[PDB]
Structure 1
Amino acid sequence: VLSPADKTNVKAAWGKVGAHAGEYGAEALERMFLSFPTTKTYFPHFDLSHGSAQVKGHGKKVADALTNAVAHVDDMPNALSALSDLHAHKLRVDPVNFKLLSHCLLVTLAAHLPAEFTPAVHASLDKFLASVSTVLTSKYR
């Protein structure tokens, strides 16, 4: 569960990402695909080379979804419900893979926004990503 300090720290850190979202969501996916090869298997219809249009396009979608979760943070289950249908029932994604993308997403954030990645903001973001992961992996229909 997110604290009043957690919620705002995320909003102010994802706000600094801003226009760079699609680029970060793209780097996170590629970091995940290279670093954890077993994750590639969820994307067999994908063009998985560096500079793919698919992963650059998917990254915008992933980053935008997370931007939606920053927008509706006090009610993420209500917000991400078409996405849970997708990842939980349709895709049956293992939550271990969510820990992986969440880790690569923190690495990306750490690589790009050094002044934003305070231990406190790192804490809140990990927590935030753990929460979207729960929702997206849980069937609550």
Structure 2
Amino acid sequence: ELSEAERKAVQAMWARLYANSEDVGVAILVRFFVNFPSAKQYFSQFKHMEDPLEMERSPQLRKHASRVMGALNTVVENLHDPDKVSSVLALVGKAHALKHKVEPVYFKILSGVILEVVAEEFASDFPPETQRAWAKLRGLIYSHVTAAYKEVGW
């Protein structure tokens, strides 16, 4: 789990992100789909879309952006309550394993894009203590999502 200082570091960072949650979520996903075109295969309204301006304006992209940011928000705000973070990430993990059939490695890829976007957009607020805290959060997400895939015999 995150230590108290790490949790505080992650929540303070996340608050800055979430002040324009909508735009940050979308910028993250556009970068994800441009840089990893294979990930678009799970999205019916944009699986063959290439123009990043259209991706930015895509209703189904912006919707998934809103749901990624909201589920992340739930995890970050409730990091002091580890049963809640377990709860949320299971539900996500399973859902993506079973309904959406997404290869679990795409979570690792998306997290790397999330890191790249955070490092760019909020660099002057991203000291090493915070970078390390954020990296623990990423590990936490990937291990919990990865355990949920194993749980239903992926």
Structure number with greater Rg is: 2
Aligned to 1:81: 90
Distance 1:56 1:93 in 2: 18
What residue in structure 2 maps to residue 134 of structure 1? Answer: 143
Extract unaligned runs of 5+ from structure 1.
Answer: none
Name the residue aligned to 1:102. 111
- Deviates most, 27-36 or 122-131: 122-131
1:12 pairs with 2:6: no
Match of 1:32 in 2: 32
Figure out how many residues of one structure are paired with residues of the other and give that number.
140
CA RMSD of superposed structures (Å): 2.0
Identical columns (%)? 29
Amino acid across the alignment from 1:10: V
Structure 1 runs of 4+ aligned residues shifted over 6 Å read: none
Residue 3 of structure 2 is aligned to residue 22 of structure 1: no
With a CA cutoff of 8 Å and minimum separation of 6, indicate the structure with the bigger relative contact order: 1
Q: Do the aligned residues in 2 keep the contact of 1:88 with 1:137 (CA within 8 Å)?
A: no
Q: Give the TM-score, by structure 1 length.
A: 0.85
* SS of equivalent residue, structure 2 residue 92: helix
8 Å Cα contact 1:25-1:62 kept in structure 2: yes
Question: How far did 1:39 drift?
Answer: 1.2
Output the CA distance in 2 between the equivalents of 1:6 and 1:89.
32
User: Could you say if the C-alpha distance between residues 20 and 94 of structure 1 is closer, same or farther in structure 2, counting changes exceeding 3 Å?
Assistant: same
Question: Could you give the per-residue CA deviations for residues 92-112 of structure 1, whole angstroms, max 9, x where no partner exists?
Answer: 432321111111111111222
Q: What residue is the counterpart of 1:46 in the other structure?
A: 45
Residue 5 of structure 1: how far off its partner (Å): 2.5
